[PDB]
A paper describes a structure:
In oxygenic photosynthesis, carried out by plants, algae and cyanobacteria, transformation of light into chemical energy takes place in Photosystem I and Photosystem II (PSII). The latter harbors the water-oxidizing complex (WOC), which is responsible for oxygen evolution. In the last decade, X-ray crystal structures of the dimeric PSII core complexes (dPSIIcc) from the thermophilic cyanobacteria Thermosynechococcus elongatus (T. elongatus) and Thermosynechococcus vulcanus (T. vulcanus) showed that each monomer contains at least 20 protein subunits including nearly 100 cofactors and an inorganic metal-cluster, designated as the Mn4CaO5-cluster, which catalyzes the oxidation of two molecules of water yielding molecular oxygen, four protons and four 'energized' electrons. In cyanobacteria, three membrane-extrinsic subunits are located at the lumenal side of the thylakoid membrane: PsbO (33 kDa), PsbV (cyt c-550) and PsbU (12 kDa).
The complete depletion of the Mn4CaO5-cluster was achieved by employing a mixture of NH2OH as a reducing agent of the Mn-ions and ethylenediaminetetraacetic acid (EDTA), a chelator for Mn2+ as well as Ca2+ ions. Cluster-coordinating protein side chains nevertheless are found in positions very similar to the native structure. While PsbU of both monomers is well resolved, the electron density map of PsbU in the unlocked monomer (which is not stabilized by a crystal contact) is noticeably perturbed in the present structure and apparently more mobile, as judged by atomic B-factors. The increased disorder follows through the entire subunit in the one monomer and is translated into the WOC binding site by an interaction of the C-terminal loop of PsbU at Tyr103 which stacks against Pro340 in the C-terminal loop of D1. At the WOC binding site, all cluster-ligating side chains, with the exception of Asp170 (located at the opposite side of the WOC site), are more disordered in the unlocked monomer than in the locked monomer even though the cluster is absent in both. They are approximately located at the positions of the two oxygen atoms (O2 and O3) that bridge between Mn2 and Mn3 in the intact complex.
Author numbering:
A (entry chain E): 3 to 83
B (entry chain D): 13 to 352
C (entry chain V): 1 to 137
D (entry chain F): 13 to 45
E (entry chain A): 12 to 344
F (entry chain I): 1 to 33
G (entry chain C): 27 to 473
């Protein structure tokens, strides 16, 4: 039988829904866009930008060597850029 | 009482059942799945592996991975508040913290799901064989993602969560453990493929032995879930397979148990053998064959050819697959046949 | 690491003069090199004769010297063997043999400077990988 | 019919970030090295 | 009529095994391939598969166990040429060059093709619907892919899958080195087909065993609650659907047995079809995705991904397969 | 060798002829209804 | 609606089985799609075509078909004028609109059945006379179409002939081969290596000739089927229904698709390598040639050079003795091509001709074909799988060979599907087993 919530059919059909969601779905989508276009996603997650993988004269990969001072080792890598 | 009141609400018949098991399942599953999605979209692997691995870096759906932590972290739980990250979300990501986050929240999610199958089975009135059968997925996940790296030097040599990363894992296991030669993996092949076979053949048999219960040429309408009669003919399906193959099922209960048994048994066998590979206790060689081949350079089997391939894999992929080893192989040590 | 003016500065002739290519110029040579050359010369090797690669070191010991813009343009106009003894346009694409090598017909003088610029620039970016073959893949 | 339910929460914890992530992944196609 | 008696027995439904007209080809061809396989697995001498006069031992009596033993494919010098016994100057030359392989695989492919037809045939004689043979087409196509189709496109039965456990693995490894089949979406759909089939097989079996209707005591097997040919269903589909619909949500469950059983057929068969097609189209060197050096930094440095790690492993298989057979730097055969 | 070739050619012809002539000897009529 | 016919929406075209007007409509509508794609694809190819590049470096499969028919090309395959490509696309595209207009009209506007509208176009599937008659008409059309190829080759410019002396060119075909011992000798060669069945046809004379033959065979059979009804042995050996005939053609379309695969993979006559890129065997043979020429120029004696295995490094023998290219290309020694046949003597490759008679255009051709082998990744990276990105290329031969094997395999599945169903519909149990008359329940027990 039916459990009790409003059917999804009647919801994506109803006018109230698309009044609300023609703003919300684009808003989040634009939000996601701005998260990348502002460069915020780079700094939140620490992912290198195309110019931040090496120094201008380096082909050695910045591999973490020590377990416990590792946090500091990554930051000594970012400084050499 | 408040416990009986909370039990009343957790066990409510909704669209998505919750249950007591939901308090464990949903947050852990949602966090495992959210952590994979988060990392494959944004998080690098440049400091753990020297690899790119996010949509943000240029990777596609086949090459994104939440990659394993660097070998130097050992078997560190790599907690956010632990000693390596020290509460820095940025550094935790850069150090591989999403890997343990996913694996651990995933492990507990799988516990929650199996408890869920128990919880729903008891409320509904059925035996709990579906949860029993889910043991095989859990046994596989535990052996490959937890035990296997716990056996090895670090979480680094666990599978990284990604499509191509998983493929590399497959190839590492051929070149290093000669995993195809292990009879416990062979028993898994036979239970996976034999399960596919039983799935295909039982579905076809039922669909091609149906009784005529409607007049429509699309035969699906001719079933009502509340009906009492079998919808296909066990007698006719039996004679057919008796005369085609030699043997045929004659007991519907044994047939469906057998469909449980086979792929469940096989995944459990492959876990066992992975447990062996945690310790490098491989089926890598046959001693008799190596003794013959060392004394007789004209002896050549497909077994000895595969070993040449394993040796090529190891020397050609190890300098970049194991970058903490600072491997430098000068060209002349690389194994290679003529021309190539 | 960036495609800097320092990176894009390669020898012009054999007397020490240089030329500084733009990013756009470098990207042109890379596209033109893939159109005309990469079938035989991908990655700086030479599929139809691995003994002669596009490495700056090798081009320097060629006759005439081919490790600057001049000689590579000249070579794309009138190629010779490694000692400059035989002219080989009959078997190597060039402007002289554009009748039998059609992909060389539509190449301007600017297009030859870019391609040469890309041949000299790429080993600076990728180092031993340029010309090293599948060991460095 | 009620409007907010356990389902409501479930669809929105999957869907809200999905559209957000598709947006972020959308813009990533225009990143030039 | 005497021919009508023969035809009445060929097509009889009262035979313990159904023969049929497809069977008039199936029985001799399979018997020939089976007898020759057994004899060559035990006794064959070494075979010069790569046509470089470096013979490869494959039989038990020549120092192989069940795992390392194979009927070795016929010589690369032979290529796609037909090579029966009578084309050879002597049995000794035939064994050296890989004769039993062609004899076996061609008789087997013929025999299994007629096995498929036999399935349609008996089904027609029994009043059945006819499509079981369509399901069996998925493994048959797969066998066709690795014994016949892949040799055609590559140009030699010597690249056929060896008839042996280790030989099979040598086939998979060299295939991945040459075609990157892990990165090919048609093999991925095959994985999705056999994994999914294993899962669904597991699922259907646990769900039906779960809903079995109490008919026995505890001191006996639940199986003795079903008697061969009862008209009542032995489990409760409604309870099973009640369970599984709550496990996920109700619309993600099957309440129609025929609709569920159709899904059980279609998921592995389609996926195996595609993976047969993947071997069959990689035969013509349309290979899996190649992402080598796909990600680059702003200076132009390569930034490896996992694809580039897969390549380092592919390379190591590449330069070691057929280690003496290449005289020129491109692997075009 | 040639004796074998002729022997197999005869064998193969024999069975192939059983197949074509068997399936022409009224197959559709051989069914239960 | 499904309650009226029995078939569901996903099997909705089965509602057309006994509605000849709508069925005609879908058919004519589908034929428009084919012709539409043919014209549309051509213009796309022409809008992207570059004359200075070979056709096979550009992802073209249609322009190669048009050029093989002798339109657009000059000596050695060079494109000299592109207007004939343009016409072929426009005309197909314009025609598709016609085929579409009639197809849609018959589908939703015309009369659903034809049997009451006209006694000539109407048909009942079980009517063996009318079916053989429709078969006969179409056989006649097929014969005419095969003769149009003859006429284009003999009377209207000819065909491209990669074998033409001085290098391939357009050539008018004056003496088609009519000798039945040659034309039907192809139909009797072995499919296996060094033979090739019909795929081995290696001269336009044999091609043009075979088409004169099937052109005549078809028209005769067409007349024969218009005038006769099926004999009694055929009546009792077949199933006479619409689905049954559809299955018979699926099997045939399948067999043809496999054959098409092998043709474009091995044959370089009706698929000129000038247009389609070298074949697999060819590019490998071209590789061996290229290194022979290079090493010999350095001073090697390619006849007596022994290779690591002991076999010859450049030259060995075949199993029947012929001098062939050495190395792993030994498998490809059945290859034949115009760039290599000048070096072929009666005993195989002639060591003297190798030493003194190799011409620059051959060295250029071998190098070109070696570095354009039909090997590439799904995303069109050219080479072995271990190749780094750089070369955007997959041979048209790979693309054409792989697609038509897929289509062929699925149409064989289609044949098995509709064949068995046709047989069960005719016998009356395609919907399942009658409970009150279960056949097995009346047979005796196996034991
Ligand atoms: C009713 C039907 C029942 C049939 C029952 C069995 C009957 C015999 C079956 C034989 C099976 C195929 C074996 C041959 C495979 C093959 O090597 O076929 C290749 C041949 C081509 O032969 C090649 O042909 C070449 C021709 O090129 C030559 O000529 C050219 C001319 O330009 C060039 O010059 C070229 O350089 C030159 O070498 C050469 O001869 C090669 O050496 C030679 O190998 O194509 C061909 O015969 C044409 C296509 C043959 C069929 C293709 C395979 C189909 C299999 C699909 C099975 C799927 C089952 C699914 C079930 C679910
Ligand atoms: C469920 C359906 C999924 C459909 C696929 C969705 C993504 C499609 C995007 C795409 O494809 O995009 C790719 C291209 C368009 O992109 C262009 O792709 C080109 C493809 O290369 C081609 O062009 C190159 C340069 O001109 C070379 O000539 C090369 O050899 C040639 O193959 C180039 O790389 C261009 O740089 C690039 O812009 O779409 C195309 O081609 C159009 C392809 C349409 C379908 C073609 C049917 C072919 C059937 C083969 C099946 C056989 C078995 C295969 C196994 C699976
Ligand atoms: C015929 C080919 C073949 C076959 C049939 C198999 C079959 C198998 N292999 Mg083997 N293997 C092969 C070839 C083959 N292999 C070859 C040639 C190699 C190279 C040597 C390998 C290398 C290899 C490795 C390295 C491993 C296997 C393993 C396995 C097993 C995996 C079972 C499974 O489902 O894991 C899948 C994983 C699980 C079921 C874990 C639980 C997962 C949960 C339930 C997922 C839930 C997801 C969640 C809902 C959200 C997902 C969302 C997201 C998609 C967006 C299985 C027995 C594995 C093994 O033995 O494990 C014990 C293993 O680690 N194979
Ligand atoms: C090549 C594809 C193809 C073709 C040619 C047809 C054709 C047909 N189908 Mg089938 N069908 C197809 C694919 C196709 N189908 C597929 C893929 C499905 C699965 C979704 C179905 C499912 C299906 C069902 C369930 C049914 C049919 C039926 C029909 C027939 C009547 C349709 C109708 O009533 O339309 C009415 C629709 C319209 C009037 C809307 C407009 C449609 C037209 C054709 C648009 C044309 C646009 C075009 C650009 C105009 C060109 C103009 C010209 C000047 C160039 C018709 C002969 C019906 C049948 O058998 O009835 C007895 C039926 O019940 N089909
Ligand atoms: C036999 C048909 C065929 C063949 C051989 C080719 C071959 C080619 N086409 Mg063409 N093309 C075709 C049909 C074909 N095309 C069709 C039908 C269309 C209309 C959409 C086009 C439109 C088209 C365009 C617009 C272009 C090409 C181009 C190309 C080239 C690149 C192909 C590529 O990268 O694909 C990419 C590969 C794929 C998309 C993989 C698809 C896999 C399919 C979906 C598998 C299907 C399996 C099966 C049928 C599914 C049913 C299963 C079920 C029954 C169980 C290549 C030379 C390109 C070119 O270079 O032009 C100069 C180009 O731009 N084609
Ligand atoms: C295979 C195709 C085909 C078939 C079998 C039919 C059959 C029929 N059509 Mg239809 N029709 C078709 C295609 C077809 N049509 C096309 C393509 C169009 C669009 C142009 C139309 C437009 C159309 C209309 C508008 C009408 C019909 C009608 C009819 C009926 C009467 C025809 C008659 O008496 O002709 C008698 C014979 C002739 C008039 C001479 C025809 C000469 C032909 C065209 C010469 C060219 C032949 C050559 C081989 C064609 C090559 C085609 C190319 C793609 C290869 C009949 C049931 C009528 C109907 O049913 O009304 C209720 C009606 O009104 N058709
Ligand atoms: C599209 C083509 C086509 C089609 C569909 C038909 C269909 C039909 N024809 Mg017609 N026919 C055609 C073309 C066609 N014909 C042409 C062009 C001619 C002129 C040569 C003839 C001459 C002809 C005659 C003389 C007769 C028919 C008859 C028949 C009917 C029975 C066919 C049969 O039993 O085949 C089954 C085929 C066999 C039983 C042959 C034996 C098995 C062979 C050897 C199998 C070989 C296959 C194998 C894979 C090799 C293939 C490649 C190569 C080596 C040959 C049927 C209605 C019969 C009838 O009743 O007419 C009134 C009849 O007597 N046709
Ligand atoms: C219409 C498209 C067909 C696609 C290929 C065929 C799919 C199913 C084949 C499985 C055969 C299994 C063995 C016997 C199985 C068997 O016995 O089937 C039995 C089952 C029921 O048969 P019925 O007799 O009721 O219906 C068949 C005819 O009689 C029509 O009424 O058949 C179907 O439902 C066919 C459904 C057609 C619609 C299929 C669409 C599904 C594919 C969609 C595309 C997927 C692409 C994936 C890309 C990655
Ligand atoms: C990590 C972490 C966390 C978490 C977070 C989360 C929870 C997130 C989520 C997220 C999410 C939740 C996301 C999502 C995403 C999604 C996506 C990104 C999707 C996409 C899709 C697509 C793309 C599709 C595709 C397809 C398919 C699959 C089908 C059909 C075909 C197609 C192609 C259409 C926290 C902070 C708590 C803590 C710390 C750590
Ligand atoms: C039945 C049916 C169907 C189908 C339909 C169809 C299939 C149709 C077809 C249709 C068609 C098939 C159409 C066609 C059309 C075409 C056209 C419309 C064209 C036009 C063209 C033009 C106009 C051209 C132009 C030009 C020129 C002249 C030159 C060059 C350039 C250009 C291109 C501009 C369906 C499925 C839907 C479903 C329902 C029913
Ligand atoms: C054009 C051309 C040519 C020629 C061609 C020809 C001349 C063809 C012919 C063809 C033919 C002449 C074909 C035929 C075929 C046949 C078939 C395909 C058959 C089928 C059969 C069937 C299907 C049967 C069945 C059955 C049986 C087995 C038993 C009883 C039952 C039944 C009836 C079902 C050449 C190569 C010179 C060159 C290129 C171009
Ligand atoms: Cl090997
Ligand atoms: Cl070689
Ligand atoms: Fe079942």
């Amino acid at each position: 039988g039916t459990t009790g919530e409003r059917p999804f059919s009647d919801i994506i059909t109803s006018v109230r829904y698309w009044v609300i969601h023609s703003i919300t779905i684009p808003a989040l989508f634009i939000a996601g866009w701005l998260f990348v276009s502002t460069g915020l996603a780079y700094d939140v997650f620490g992912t290198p930008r195309p110019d931040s993988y090496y120094a201008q004269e380096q082909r050695s990969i910045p591999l973490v060597t020590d377990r416990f001072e590792a946090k500091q080792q990554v930051e000594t890598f970012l400084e050499q850029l | 009482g408040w416990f009986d009141i909370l039990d009343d609400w957790l066990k409510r018949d909704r669209f998505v059942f919750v249950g007591w098991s939901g308090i464990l399942l949903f947050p852990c599953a949602y966090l495992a799945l959210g952590g994979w999605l988060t990392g494959t979209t944004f998080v690098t692997s440049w400091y753990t592996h020297g690899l790119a691995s996010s949509y943000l870096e240029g990777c596609n759906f086949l090459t994104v991975a939440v990659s394993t932590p660097a070998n130097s972290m050992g078997h560190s739980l790599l907690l956010l508040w632990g000693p390596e990250a020290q509460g820095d979300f940025t550094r935790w990501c850069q150090l591989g913290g999403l890997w343990t986050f996913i694996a651990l929240h995933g492990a507990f999610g799988l516990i929650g799901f199996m408890l869920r199958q128990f919880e729903i089975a008891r409320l509904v009135g059925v035996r709990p064989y579906n949860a029993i059968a889910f043991s095989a997925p859990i046994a596989v996940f535990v052996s490959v993602f937890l035990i296997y790296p716990l056996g090895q030097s670090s979480w680094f040599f666990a599978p990284s969560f990604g499509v191509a990363a998983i493929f590399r894992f497959l190839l590492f296991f051929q070149g290093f453990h000669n995993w195809t030669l292990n009879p416990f993996h062979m028993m898994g092949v036979a239970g996976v493929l034999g399960g596919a076979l039983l799935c295909a053949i039982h579905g076809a048999t039922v669909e091609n032995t149906l009784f005529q219960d409607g007049e429509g040429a699309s035969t699906f309408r001719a079933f009502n879930p509340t009906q009492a009669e079998e919808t296909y003919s066990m007698v006719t399906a039996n004679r057919f397979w008796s005369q085609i193959f030699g043997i045929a099922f004659s007991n519907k209960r044994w047939l469906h148990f057998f469909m449980l048994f086979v792929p469940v048994t096989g995944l459990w066998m492959s876990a066992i053998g992975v447990v062996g590979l945690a310790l490098n206790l491989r089926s890598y060689d046959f001693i008799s064959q190596e003794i013959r081949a060392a004394e007789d350079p004209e002896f050549e089997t497909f077994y000895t050819k595969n070993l040449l391939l394993n040796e090529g894999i190891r020397a050609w992929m190890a300098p970049q697959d194991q970058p903490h080893e600072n491997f430098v192989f000068p060209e002349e040590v690389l194994p290679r046949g003529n021309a190539l | 690491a960036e495609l800097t003016p320092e990176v894009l500065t390669v020898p012009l002739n054999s007397e020490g003069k240089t030329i500084t290519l733009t990013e756009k110029q470098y990207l042109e040579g890379k596209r033109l090199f893939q159109y005309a050359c990469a079938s035989c010369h991908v990655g700086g090797i030479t599929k139809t004769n691995p003994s002669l690669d596009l490495r700056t070191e090798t081009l320097a010991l060629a006759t005439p010297p081919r490790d600057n813009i001049e000689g590579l343009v000249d070579y794309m106009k009138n190629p010779t063997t490694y000692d400059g003894e035989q002219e080989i346009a009959e078997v190597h694409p060039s402007l002289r043999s554009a009748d039998i090598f059609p992909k060389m017909r539509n190449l301007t003088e600017k297009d030859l400077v870019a391609i040469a610029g890309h041949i000299l620039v790429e080993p600076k970016i990728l180092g031993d990988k340029w010309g090293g073959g599948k060991v460095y893949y | 019919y009620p409007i907010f339910t356990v389902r409501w929460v479930a669809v929105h914890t999957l869907a809200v970030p999905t559209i957000f992530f598709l947006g972020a992944i959308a813009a990533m196609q225009f990143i030039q090295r | 009529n005497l021919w009508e008696r023969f035809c009445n027995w060929v097509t009889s439904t009262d035979n313990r095994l159904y023969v049929g007209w497809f069977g008039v080809i199936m029985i001799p061809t399979l018997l020939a391939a089976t007898i020759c396989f057994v004899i060559a697995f035990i006794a064959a001498p070494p075979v010069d598969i790569d046509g470089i006069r470096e013979p490869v031992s494959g039989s038990l009596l020549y120092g192989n166990n069940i795992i390392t033993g194979a009927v070795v494919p016929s010589s690369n010098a032979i290529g796609l040429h037909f090579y029966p016994i009578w084309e050879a100057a002597s049995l000794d030359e035939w064994l050296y060059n890989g004769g039993p392989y062609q004899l076996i695989i061609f008789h087997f492919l013929l025999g299994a093709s007629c096995y498929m037809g036999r399935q349609w045939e008996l089904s027609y004689r029994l009043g059945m619907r006819p499509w079981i043979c369509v399901a069996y087409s998925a493994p048959l196509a797969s066998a066709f892919a690795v014994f016949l189709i892949y040799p055609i496109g590559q140009g030699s039965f010597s690249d056929g899958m060896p008839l042996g456990i280790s030989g099979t693995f040598n086939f998979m490894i060299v295939f991945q080195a040459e075609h990157n089949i892990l990165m090919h979406p048609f093999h991925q759909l095959g994985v999705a087909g056999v994994f999914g089939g294993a899962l669904f097989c597991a699922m259907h079996g646990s769900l039906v065993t779960s809903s079995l209707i109490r008919e026995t005591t505890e001191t006996e097997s639940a199986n003795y609650g079903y008697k061969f040919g009862q008209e009542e269903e032995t489990y409760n589909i409604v309870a099973a659907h009640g369970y599984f619909g709550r496990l996920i949500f109700q619309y993600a469950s099957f309440n129609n047995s025929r609709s569920l059983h159709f899904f059980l057929a279609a998921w592995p068969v389609v996926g195996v079809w595609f993976t047969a097609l993947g071997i069959s189209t990689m035969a013509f060197n349309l290979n899996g995705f190649n992402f080598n050096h796909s990600v680059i930094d702003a200076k132009g440095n390569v930034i490896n991904t996992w694809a580039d790690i897969i390549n380092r492993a592919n390379l190591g298989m590449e330069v070691m397969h057929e280690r003496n057979a290449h005289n020129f730097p491109l692997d075009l055969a | 060798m040639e004796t074998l070739k002729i022997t197999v050619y005869i064998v193969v012809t024999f069975f192939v002829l059983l197949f074509v002539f068997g399936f022409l000897s009224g197959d559709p009529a051989r069914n239960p209804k | 609606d499904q309650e009226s016919s029995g078939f569901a929406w996903w099997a909705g075209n089965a509602r057309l089985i006994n509605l000849s007007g709508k069925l005609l409509g879908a058919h004519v509508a589908h034929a428009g799609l084919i012709v539409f794609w043919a014209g549309a694809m051509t213009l796309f190819e022409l809008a992207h075509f570059i004359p200075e590049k070979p056709m096979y470096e550009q992802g073209l499969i249609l322009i190669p078909h048009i050029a093989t028919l002798g339109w657009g090309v000059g000596p050695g395959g060079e494109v000299v004028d592109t207007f004939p490509f343009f016409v072929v696309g426009v005309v197909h595209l314009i025609s598709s609109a016609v085929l579409g207009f009639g197809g849609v009209y018959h589908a939703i506007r015309g009369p659903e059945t034809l049997e009451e509208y006209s006694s000539f176009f109407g048909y009942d599937w079980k009517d063996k006379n009318k079916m053989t008659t429709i078969l006969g008409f179409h056989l006649i059309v097929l014969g005419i179409g095969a003769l149009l190829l003859v006429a284009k080759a003999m009377f209207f410019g000819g065909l491209y002939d990669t074998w033409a002396p001085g290098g391939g060119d357009v050539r008018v075909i004056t003496n088609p081969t009519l000798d039945p011992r040659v034309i039907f000798g192809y139909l009797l060669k072995s499919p296996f290596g060094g033979e090739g069945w019909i795929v081995s046809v290696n001269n336009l004379e044999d091609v043009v000739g075979g088409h004169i033959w099937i052109g005549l065979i078809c028209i005769a059979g067409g007349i024969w089927h218009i005038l006769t009804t099926p004999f009694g042995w055929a009546r009792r050996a077949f199933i006479w229904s619409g689905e049954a005939y559809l299955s018979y053609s699926l099997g045939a379309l399948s067999m043809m698709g496999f054959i098409a695969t092998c043709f474009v993979w091995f044959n370089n006559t009706v698929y000129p390598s000038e247009f389609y890129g070298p074949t697999g065997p060819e590019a490998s043979q071209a590789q061996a040639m290229t290194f022979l020429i290079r090493d010999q120029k350095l001073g090697a004696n390619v006849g007596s050079a022994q290779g690591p295995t002991g076999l010859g490094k450049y030259l060995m023998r075949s199993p029947t003795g012929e001098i062939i290219f050495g190395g792993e290309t030994m498998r490809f020694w059945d290859f034949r091509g115009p760039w290599l046949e000048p070096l072929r003597g009666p005993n195989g490759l002639d060591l003297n001709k190798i030493k003194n008679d190799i011409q620059p255009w051959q060295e250029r051709r071998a190098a070109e074909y070696m570095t354009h082998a039909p090997l590439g990744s799904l995303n069109s990276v050219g080479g072995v799988a271990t190749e780094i990105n750089s070369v955007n290329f997959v041979s048209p031969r790979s693309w054409l060979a792989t697609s038509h094997f897929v289509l062929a395999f699925f149409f064989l599945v289609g044949h098995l599907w509709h064949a068995g169903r046709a047989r069960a519909a005719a016998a009356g149990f395609e919907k399942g087993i009658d409970r009150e008359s279960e056949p097995v329940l009346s047979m005796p027990s196996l034991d």
